[PDB]
Design a protein around this ligand. Structure first.
Ligand SMILES: N=C(N)c1ccc(/C=N/NC(=O)c2cccnc2)cc1
Ligand SMILES: [Ca+2]
Length: 223
């Protein structure tokens, strides 16, 4: 997250870190056994780390649980990033409490202008490189589909939305991938892609979660 703020320990209780010997992606806990992330975050040997603030220090509220299975969206295209969504099942159910909690799925799509909270442990610099240890947060508006498409001609599908600031300076970045965009207590987005980070006229692009609620629910119901 570039141009954001320190969230505060466990203030984003649905935020997960995906770990394969090191943090590599974010995700969102959606019930005691399932995490939603980006398909471009797919890999084998994932350990899901819940209750994290400092990802380099054991602070007392962590739950580390190995993934038992991952399900990349049936229609994920890694070239275009269309359908950039994946489900991860935990080997054991997380113990839910105030600091480790699920986030609600949307029942309708969010509109341009809705204010959202984007979070992660990604790069904090738009030019250089600096990775934070503690969770970073950004409040950002959803942008209109027309402005999103104008920013990225030929690249925005009906399964994507832009959020952020056309002036630049405030954005998600590398390492935030797969993490949440939460608007009025609903998971509306997943950190998906962009052109660099926090660049003028290049806002973050997010997977449009409301399009996938049917698939998420039925997938969970049979797995
Ligand atoms: N919101 C943005 N502007 C944004 C969000 C996410 C990303 C994703 N970055 N990932 C990478 O660069 C990467 C990851 C693995 C290997 N080589 C490069 C970019 C911009
Ligand atoms: Ca920790």
């Amino acid at each position: 997250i570039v141009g954001g703020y320190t969230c505060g320990a466990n203030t984003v209780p649905y935020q997960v870190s995906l770990n394969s010997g090191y943090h590599f992606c974010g995700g969102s806990l959606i019930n005691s056994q399932w995490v939603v992330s980006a398909a471009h975050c797919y890999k084998s040997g994932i350990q899901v780390r819940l209750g994290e603030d400092n990802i380099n220090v054991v602070e007392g509220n962590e739950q580390f649980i190995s993934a038992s299975k991952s399900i990349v969206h049936p229609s994920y295209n890694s070239n275009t990033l269309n359908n950039d969504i994946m489900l991860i099942k935990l080997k054991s159910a997380a113990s839910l409490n105030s600091r480790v909690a699920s986030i609600s799925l949307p029942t309708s799509c969010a509109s341009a202008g809705t204010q959202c909270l984007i979070s992660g442990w990604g790069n904090t610099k738009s030019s250089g490189t600096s990775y934070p240890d503690v969770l970073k947060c950004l409040k950002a508006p959803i942008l209109s589909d027309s402005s999103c498409k104008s920013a990225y001609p030929g690249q925005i599908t009906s399964n994507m939305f832009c959020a952020g600031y056309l002036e630049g300076g405030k954005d998600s970045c590398q390492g935030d991938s797969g993490g949440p965009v939460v608007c009025s207590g609903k998971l509306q987005g997943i950190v998906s892609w962009g052109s660099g980070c926090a660049q003028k006229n290049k806002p973050g692009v997010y997977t449009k979660v409301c399009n996938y609620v049917s698939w998420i629910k039925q997938t969970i119901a049979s797995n």
